[PDB]
Design a protein around this nucleic acid. Structure first.
Ligand SMILES: [Mg+2]
Ligand SMILES: [Mg+2]
Ligand SMILES: [Mg+2]
Ligand SMILES: [Mg+2]
Ligand SMILES: [Mg+2]
Ligand SMILES: [Mg+2]
Ligand SMILES: [Mg+2]
Ligand SMILES: [Mg+2]
Ligand SMILES: [Mg+2]
Ligand SMILES: [Mg+2]
Ligand SMILES: [Mg+2]
Ligand SMILES: [Mg+2]
Ligand SMILES: [Mg+2]
Ligand SMILES: [Mg+2]
Ligand SMILES: [Mg+2]
Ligand SMILES: [Mg+2]
Ligand SMILES: [Mg+2]
Ligand SMILES: [Mg+2]
Ligand SMILES: [Mg+2]
Ligand SMILES: [Mg+2]
Ligand SMILES: [Mg+2]
Ligand SMILES: [Mg+2]
Ligand SMILES: [Mg+2]
Ligand SMILES: [Mg+2]
Ligand SMILES: [Mg+2]
Ligand SMILES: [Mg+2]
Ligand SMILES: [Mg+2]
Ligand SMILES: [Mg+2]
Ligand SMILES: [Mg+2]
Ligand SMILES: [Mg+2]
Ligand SMILES: [Mg+2]
Ligand SMILES: [Mg+2]
Ligand SMILES: [Mg+2]
Ligand SMILES: [Mg+2]
Ligand SMILES: [Mg+2]
Ligand SMILES: [Mg+2]
Ligand SMILES: [Mg+2]
Ligand SMILES: [Mg+2]
Ligand SMILES: [Mg+2]
Ligand SMILES: [Mg+2]
Ligand SMILES: [Mg+2]
Ligand SMILES: [Mg+2]
Ligand SMILES: [Mg+2]
Ligand SMILES: [Mg+2]
Ligand SMILES: [Mg+2]
Ligand SMILES: [Mg+2]
Ligand SMILES: [Mg+2]
Ligand SMILES: [Mg+2]
Ligand SMILES: [Mg+2]
Ligand SMILES: [Mg+2]
Ligand SMILES: [Mg+2]
Ligand SMILES: [Mg+2]
Ligand SMILES: [Mg+2]
Ligand SMILES: [Mg+2]
Ligand SMILES: [Mg+2]
Ligand SMILES: [Mg+2]
Ligand SMILES: [Mg+2]
Ligand SMILES: [Mg+2]
Ligand SMILES: [Mg+2]
Ligand SMILES: [Mg+2]
Ligand SMILES: [Mg+2]
Ligand SMILES: [Mg+2]
Ligand SMILES: [Mg+2]
Ligand SMILES: [Mg+2]
Ligand SMILES: [Mg+2]
Ligand SMILES: [Mg+2]
Ligand SMILES: [Mg+2]
Ligand SMILES: [Mg+2]
Ligand SMILES: [Mg+2]
Ligand SMILES: [Mg+2]
Ligand SMILES: [Mg+2]
Ligand SMILES: [Mg+2]
Lengths: 150, 144, 129
RNA sequence: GGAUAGUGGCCUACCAUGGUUUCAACGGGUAACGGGGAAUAAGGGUUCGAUUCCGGAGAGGGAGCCUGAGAAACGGCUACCACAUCCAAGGAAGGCAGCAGGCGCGCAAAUUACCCAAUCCUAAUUCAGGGAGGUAGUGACAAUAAAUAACGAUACAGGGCCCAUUCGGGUCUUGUAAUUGGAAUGAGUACAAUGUAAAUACCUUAACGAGGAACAAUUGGAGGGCAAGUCUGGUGCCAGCAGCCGCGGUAAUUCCAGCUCCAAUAGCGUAUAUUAAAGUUGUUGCAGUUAAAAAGCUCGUAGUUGAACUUUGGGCCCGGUUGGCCGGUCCGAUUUUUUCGUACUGGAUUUCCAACGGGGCCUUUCCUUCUGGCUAACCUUGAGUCCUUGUGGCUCUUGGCGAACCAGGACUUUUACUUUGAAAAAAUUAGAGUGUUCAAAGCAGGCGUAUUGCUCGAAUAUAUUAGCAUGGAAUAAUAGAAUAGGACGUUUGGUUCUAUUUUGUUGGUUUCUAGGACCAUCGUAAUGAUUAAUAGGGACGGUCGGGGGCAUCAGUAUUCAAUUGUCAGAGGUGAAAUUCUUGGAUUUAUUGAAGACUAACUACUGCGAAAGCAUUUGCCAAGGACGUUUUCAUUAAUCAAGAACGAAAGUUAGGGGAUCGAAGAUGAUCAGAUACCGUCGUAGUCUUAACCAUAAACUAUGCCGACUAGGGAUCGGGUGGUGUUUUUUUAAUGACCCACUCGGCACCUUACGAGAAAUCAAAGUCUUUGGGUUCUGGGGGGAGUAUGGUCGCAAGGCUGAAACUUAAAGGAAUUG
RNA sequence: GAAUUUGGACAAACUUGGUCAUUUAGAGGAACUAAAAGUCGUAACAAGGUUUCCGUAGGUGAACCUGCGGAAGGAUCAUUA
RNA sequence: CUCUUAAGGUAGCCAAAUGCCUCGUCAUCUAAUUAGUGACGCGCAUGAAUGGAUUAACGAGAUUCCCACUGUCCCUAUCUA
């Protein structure tokens, strides 16, 4: 179940049995790509990119209709970020929690939550180190953390 | 399932974990700690002979009532004083003070037998003849 | 987290049999499952079974025909030397006159009768009777 | 460098700071020489190995060295240390863990015997020497074989099958004998021979050797377990017995005995250990709600463990094995009649069905390395033609360069695994052969003309790790092209490196030439990125909550106070008393202060990791579930170490101190009353900043995963409903209604299932025993004690024995 | 080439102390057990006569008593009415 | 349970700088200890801010012992101003 909660939720997406399609789309990969990069240069994350494309532009997925998943495109275009989106948002989060700790110092639950979040960050970065997307050393430092999210 | 690791590569845990657990097993620990050689009045040896210091009339445990005839012996090999029961009718008159007697276990592996308290041993020979043979008058105790 | 997949398969079958059903669902669908299901069908302890193509790992619908008592897995898939098959069959089979202990040999997956013939061995997958 | 026979920090000089470790180093212990092997027989295991063979070490303790090929030798020497002998007192000498033998030690272990006859060793050596070794002595270590009696006679009794009318009873066959008689024999004692090195015993054999005071079998036991006395005499909770339950207190089936009886028997008992029994150590294979036992909680490293996919399927060739069938005769041939039916052998190929197994191919598929063969194509020199076009098309010709193709040898990206072998001491073990008279044994022997010979043997299995060799590639790991520093090649440049032969020889140099390494260039190519887990994380969306922190607001009450009106009681209790009261108690009124608390609403309702969380509002960061054709793509599950949080009490201080209230004080009660009840009241109760780390921290029930059953509620979310209700007119919207659906707090019924039961939707899917994984228990006490360590201001926490003791302690249910 | 003798490495061993291991005496102290008997009370088991138990704290001849928080293993599965 | 003048020695501690008897008894240290220490306690006459018990550090304080040291001594001699 959940990694840090004791939750047992299944609320997921549900990708269709349809590696091709849709018969009503009509717009060509080459076009949609130049919209992804348009947004990625306007500073947008893969997650919240395919959210706009799923919504306003009627593009269902990106692995279909272009044959490539969104981030893979950004990297080809040199719009690859510094550190990954998960790791990032985790690090941003952990930062803000600590920033709350620094004034509210009796918030024992706060401290608890930071221990959870930063567990996650390290577990992540460990893997990311394992598959060469972060340098051999790297590691998440708290003191320097606020810097890495700018 | 089961609460024990089942990995094909878990031998170490399964191995140390039982080695760890053999200790709750009394007979094992006695053997490993050499209680036998240390705390036991005999060496671990099956028999010991010592010299009879005094005669004792230890009374029985409940719900019995009698005066079990015993002797405080002092073991030669390690000067230990332990007392031993003297079996059969009036055999207590076969042993004398300062008389050098062979003791044996009560066949309980260290525990006390029956209602005789504190007594974990028995007299088997006395002045080196056999208590059994004396009681049956087929042998005679050599003079003191 | 799922661990054996060939465990939860055989269990569902086992479970569904006991409760009087003549059909099961098996998610997910590993090849090891099917090859096992094959071995288990070659001696008719199950009937027809049909793969279902999710764009994922699969499902299976197996038809049951009674006469199954237990289809078991053995974990960890121990190492069995050739004259040790004799020993497992001794332990986990009902009688000398039937039942099966299917393995994994380099010569594919097969029941213990078969390996006995081809003179091969390896790990143990489980058993059927 | 020295040194050694030589490698090497073996030693030295100089230089670096390295080497080992939770995959347990280092240190401690061993009543530890290692192995072959031994005991225990479902399997798995458990325990043991000083000791016949191999290896090792040592010769009272240490060190040192002479000699020699070999010793750090001890029946060699030298010194120290510890012992200790002879002495004419000056000196001298010894080393039994060799064979005997002695002392000591202890529960515990034999002759100061004979010999080189055997087995083998040594030397100058067929001869000498050998306490090696053999022989005998002592020897109930262990193991083998197995005498202690056999057959008659008769008198009753009768198994008596009957005859049969009756004590009329046939004729063998059991049993009883103060009844009978003839046979048998080695234990012995001993001529002899044999055996032997000489003796001895064994085998063989004359002369003797049996009838009950012998040629006289014992050891335990006779309540249960557990086989066999309710017979007798004795004792009287004594003596004594009893592994355990228990027997004995004047009719003892249990003591002491007589009788008889049982069990094993040349043996039986006891003690101690150990194995089986023990699924009471649990890999197989245990137990943990209540019997012993889930850490208060969450994180987390080591460890263990980890979704699914990549040649699937088709079709050929090839020789293999168990049964159909029948011929043929050994052999017990069966229901029981005659020309009737129950283990043995022969079997190649039939297409006559079946199963099965080995080896090859084809289907895009022998790849990868190398070498050998057969050479195309390819530019190439030289001679020749053709062209509605220099087109170099075609041919032959010179020497280069070897696609494809065939064969053979090496070939796992790197492992685990598995098959088959090889290299493997004997004994032991399993086990084939063999009539030691049998047997334990042994490895012998077997045949014949036995008057100068013949002849089979001394097998086989074994080994569960590691190494080596080999067939396999399912399972499980692992490597590889992503900013292409990608792959392959008959493209070709390069600059580096090595140089076979050719320039006589050798040596230097250099040029062409060849190969390696590498860099570019050129060509060929389907040019290279698996899913998207009812795994996990991240984004997003609207929600939801008594989740958390700071600030802020409120409520009445309680106590107190100032003021207040009135007058005698008020308090408290089962009843009282102590107390308060005409300085007006109590009750009333206005008013203010303080500190805690957060009523009712409040529920089988919500939230959080647990502890726990409930007046308002503002800020502050967090969270599940849901929704989601969003994103990353194994990033995960559980976790020794380690870490956060952790009721109440308690501790260090400041603040605070209304209430209640440990200590204390008191009034009652009691026989007492240190109590319970009543009164006063310290600390405490709250907060801040530090500690503490424990509770029945409870569901007395680890977590993740999957599966098995029926129903109604309810919380959060979402979807569907020409449903209801709300206006001024019936739209949005709010609440509500119905169905669905996730994810929750629970409840109900059920019982296939589980359990000792109570009961349990898990406590089920367990002798049809295995999804992954963390922790704990192994009779009751002693005892959470002692001791050591550690953390703490302290209280204490964490870690945590043993001696001894004991037959139950304990659970659930039942009837009293 | 003997006595004799310089230095060196090897290095027994002596004196003094340290340490680790294995043992061990001790006045006296403080426990447990045999143990079921006795004296004092009656703490627990029945609502055990103040429900019991847990953690903590203090106090008492003795069992125990009291405060604060907890558990039910309670003497209540229960007030949509 | 009792006598008595208000009550009747708790927690501790000890032959202690508080103990008569007393050079207490036991253990320890020594060849030998009216000494020292550790223990015992009906303690003439210990004892709780007339403070009781503990106590690291400190002391030209009283006291015991060890090692070192030494003409203090055995046992005296010699030199300088
Ligand atoms: Mg799930
Ligand atoms: Mg987790
Ligand atoms: Mg005595
Ligand atoms: Mg060398
Ligand atoms: Mg070197
Ligand atoms: Mg260093
Ligand atoms: Mg050993
Ligand atoms: Mg030894
Ligand atoms: Mg040995
Ligand atoms: Mg051993
Ligand atoms: Mg020994
Ligand atoms: Mg030697
Ligand atoms: Mg000796
Ligand atoms: Mg020589
Ligand atoms: Mg020698
Ligand atoms: Mg020597
Ligand atoms: Mg000698
Ligand atoms: Mg000797
Ligand atoms: Mg002698
Ligand atoms: Mg003896
Ligand atoms: Mg003996
Ligand atoms: Mg000889
Ligand atoms: Mg000779
Ligand atoms: Mg001669
Ligand atoms: Mg006889
Ligand atoms: Mg006779
Ligand atoms: Mg008898
Ligand atoms: Mg019987
Ligand atoms: Mg009688
Ligand atoms: Mg009996
Ligand atoms: Mg009798
Ligand atoms: Mg058990
Ligand atoms: Mg329990
Ligand atoms: Mg607990
Ligand atoms: Mg897998
Ligand atoms: Mg060899
Ligand atoms: Mg291989
Ligand atoms: Mg998914
Ligand atoms: Mg989230
Ligand atoms: Mg008034
Ligand atoms: Mg309120
Ligand atoms: Mg821990
Ligand atoms: Mg009081
Ligand atoms: Mg008073
Ligand atoms: Mg009190
Ligand atoms: Mg606890
Ligand atoms: Mg589950
Ligand atoms: Mg249900
Ligand atoms: Mg939907
Ligand atoms: Mg809920
Ligand atoms: Mg039932
Ligand atoms: Mg009893
Ligand atoms: Mg009960
Ligand atoms: Mg009852
Ligand atoms: Mg003391
Ligand atoms: Mg005392
Ligand atoms: Mg009571
Ligand atoms: Mg009570
Ligand atoms: Mg209990
Ligand atoms: Mg008076
Ligand atoms: Mg007092
Ligand atoms: Mg007091
Ligand atoms: Mg005193
Ligand atoms: Mg003092
Ligand atoms: Mg004094
Ligand atoms: Mg002295
Ligand atoms: Mg003195
Ligand atoms: Mg003193
Ligand atoms: Mg004073
Ligand atoms: Mg005072
Ligand atoms: Mg003071
Ligand atoms: Mg001073």
């Amino acid at each position: 179940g959940r990694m840090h909660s004791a939750g047992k939720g299944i609320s997921s997406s549900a990708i269709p049995y349809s590696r091709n399609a849709p018969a009503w789309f009509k717009l060509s990969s080459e076009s949609v790509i130049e919209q992804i990069v348009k947004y990625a240069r306007k500073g947008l994350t893969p997650s919240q990119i395919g959210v706009l494309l799923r919504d306003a532009h009627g593009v269902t997925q990106a692995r279909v209709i272009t044959g490539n998943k969104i981030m893979r495109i950004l990297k080809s275009n040199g719009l690859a970020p510094e550190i990954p989106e998960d790791l990032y948002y985790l690090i941003k989060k952990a930062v803000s929690v600590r920033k709350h700790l620094e004034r509210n110092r009796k918030d024992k639950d706060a401290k608890f939550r930071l221990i959870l979040i930063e567990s996650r960050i390290h577990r992540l970065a460990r893997y990311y180190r394992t598959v060469a997307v972060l340098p051999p050393n790297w590691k998440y430092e708290s003191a320097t953390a606020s810097a890495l999210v700018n | 399932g089961k609460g024990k690791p089942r990995g094909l590569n878990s031998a170490r845990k399964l191995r140390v974990h039982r080695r760890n657990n053999r200790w709750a097993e009394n007979n094992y620990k006695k053997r490993l700690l050499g209680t036998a050689f240390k705390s036991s009045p005999f060496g671990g040896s099956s028999h010991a002979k010592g010299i009879v210091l005094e005669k004792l009339g230890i009374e029985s445990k409940q719900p019995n009532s009698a005066i079990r005839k015993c002797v405080r012996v002092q073991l030669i090999k390690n000067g230990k004083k332990v007392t031993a029961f003297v079996p059969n009718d009036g055999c207590l008159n076969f042993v004398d003070e300062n008389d050098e007697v062979l003791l044996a276990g009560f066949g309980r592996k260290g525990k006390a037998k029956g209602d005789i308290p504190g007594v974990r041993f028995k007299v088997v020979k006395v002045s080196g003849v056999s208590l059994l043979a004396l009681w049956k008058e087929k042998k005679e105790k050599p003079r003191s | 987290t799922r661990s054996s997949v060939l465990a939860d398969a055989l269990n569902a079958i086992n479970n569904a049999e006991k409760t009087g059903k003549r059909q099961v669902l098996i998610r997910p669908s590993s090849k090891v499952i099917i090859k096992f299901l094959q071995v288990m069908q070659k001696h008719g302890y199950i009937g027809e079974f049909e793969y279902i193509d999710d764009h994922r790992s699969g499902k299976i619908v197996v038809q049951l025909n009674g006469r199954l008592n237990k289809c078991g897995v053995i974990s960890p898939r121990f190492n069995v030397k050739i004259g040790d098959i004799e020993k497992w069959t001794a332990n986990l089979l009902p009688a000398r006159q039937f039942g099966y202990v299917i393995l994994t040999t380099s010569a594919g997956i097969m029941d213990h009768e078969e390996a006995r013939r081809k003179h091969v061995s390896g790990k143990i997958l489980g058993f059927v009777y």
